C-alpha cells in the first residue's frame, strides 16, 4: 500500500537506507532499526520526496553529491523514482539529474558524483512497513 511507510533495502550489501534524527544519512542491515521507516511521497508523476518518519526529515542531495536529511523541504528533496528493468528501484536527484541516492558495501552513503547506472549501489528494493 502506497500510503504506508516503506523500508528501502539496498541491493549493495543489504543495507536499509537510514535517516538519523540529527540529519545524518547512512545504511543499516538491522530491519528493526528505528530510523529506517521512510515515507515516500509523490510530488508529481515519477517524482518523490523521501521523508524519514522517525527523524521527521527529508532526504536531500547536495550540490557536491552528499546526502543529508533536511528539516523542511527544499528543491534538493526530490528524486526520480524509477522501477528499473531488473525490478529494483533507483532514486535519481531531480536537481542533480546524473546522480543517484546510493549506499557503499560498507554501509555509508555513496557520493552522487560517484554513482553510475551500472552500479549495484544505486539499486534499492522497497519493502512495506
Amino acid at each position: 500500500h502506497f500510503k504506508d511507510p516503506k523500508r528501502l533495502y539496498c541491493k549493495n550489501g543489504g543495507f536499509f537506507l537510514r535517516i538519523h534524527p540529527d540529519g545524518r544519512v547512512d545504511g543499516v542491515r538491522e530491519k528493526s532499526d528505528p530510523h529506517i521507516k521512510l515515507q515516500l511521497q509523490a510530488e508529481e508523476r515519477g517524482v518523490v520526496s523521501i521523508k524519514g518518519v522517525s527523524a521527521n526529515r527529508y532526504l536531500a542531495m547536495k550540490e557536491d553529491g552528499r546526502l543529508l536529511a533536511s528539516k523542511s523541504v527544499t528543491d534538493e528533496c526530490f528524486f526520480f523514482e524509477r522501477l528499473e528493468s531488473n525490478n529494483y528501484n533507483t532514486y535519481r536527484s531531480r536537481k542533480y539529474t546524473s546522480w543517484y541516492v546510493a549506499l557503499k558495501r560498507t554501509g555509508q552513503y555513496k557520493l552522487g558524483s560517484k554513482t553510475g547506472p551500472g552500479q549495484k549501489a544505486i539499486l534499492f528494493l522497497p519493502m512495506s512497513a
Binding site: 550489501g13 515515507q39 510530488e43 517524482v47 519493502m127
Partner: protein, 211 residues
C-alpha cells in the same frame, strides 16, 4: 590432524537477510573447512529441504558450499540454514529470504469508486478513490467545468478545477477521499480521481447530482 568444521570466509556471510524481487536467482554460501572434510546440508525453516520442495528444485555446489535457487517466488520466503559437520563438530548459519512481487504498470483504481451520488442541496458528500501502485502514485482530484455549453475547450481538453493534489502539503493519508462540505446546485457535476506513476496514468470519474 583432526579439525572441527570452521568458516573459511566469514566475510562472505555478513549479509544475513536476502530481500529480492520475485524471479531472481538466489545463492546462499557457507564457505567452511575441516578434517575430515565436513558434510553440507540445508534446511528450509528448520526442516529437511529436499529439491522436490520447489518447482525446478535447486542446485547444491558442494565445492562452493552453496545452494542455489532459480526464479524465487513468495513460497520460497523463509529461513535457510546450512549445517556443515564432521566427527569433531558442526557449525550452522541461517539466511533470511524475502521475495517481493512488484508490478510495472500504471496505477489501478478500484472499480466502482468514486461512485455517482445524488444528494439534497446543502448535504455533505464525500467521494472515495482506492488506488494501487507499486511505484508511488500521484493522485489528484478534479471537477469538470462548463464555460458556456462546452465542457471541452479550444485545445479539445476538458476544462477542470484542481480540487486536491497529493504532495508534502497533502499527504497520501487524505488523498483517497474528496470531501464536499455543504453542497449547492453549483457543486453538481462530474468529479474525477486521477492517479499516475512514471509508467502511465489512470482515472475514474463519478457524477454528483444535487436536489
Amino acid at each position: 590432524m583432526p579439525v572441527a568444521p570452521y568458516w573459511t570466509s566469514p566475510e562472505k556471510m555478513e549479509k544475513k537477510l536476502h530481500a529480492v524481487p520475485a524471479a531472481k536467482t538466489v545463492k546462499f554460501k557457507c564457505p567452511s573447512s575441516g578434517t575430515p572434510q565436513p558434510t553440507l546440508r540445508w534446511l528450509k525453516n528448520g526442516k529437511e529441504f529436499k529439491p522436490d520442495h520447489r518447482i525446478g528444485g535447486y542446485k547444491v555446489r558442494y565445492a562452493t558450499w552453496s545452494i542455489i535457487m532459480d526464479s524465487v517466488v513468495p513460497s520460497d520466503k523463509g529461513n535457510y540454514t546450512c549445517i556443515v559437520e564432521n566427527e569433531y563438530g558442526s557449525i550452522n548459519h541461517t539466511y533470511q529470504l524475502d521475495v517481493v512481487e512488484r508490478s510495472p504498470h500504471r496505477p489501478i483504481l478500484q472499480a466502482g469508486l468514486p461512485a455517482n451520488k445524488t444528494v439534497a442541496l446543502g448535504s455533505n458528500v464525500e467521494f472515495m478513490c482506492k488506488v494501487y501502485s507499486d511505484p508511488q502514485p500521484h493522485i489528484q482530484w478534479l471537477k469538470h467545468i462548463e464555460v458556456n455549453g462546452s465542457k471541452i475547450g479550444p485545445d479539445n481538453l476538458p476544462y477542470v478545477q484542481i480540487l486536491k493534489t497529493a504532495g508534502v502539503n497533502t499527504t497520501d493519508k487524505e488523498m483517497e477521499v474528496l470531501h464536499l462540505r455543504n453542497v449547492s446546485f453549483e457543486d453538481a457535476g462530474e468529479y474525477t480521481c486521477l492517479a499516475g506513476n512514471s509508467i502511465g496514468l489512470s482515472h475514474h470519474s463519478a457524477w454528483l447530482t444535487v436536489l
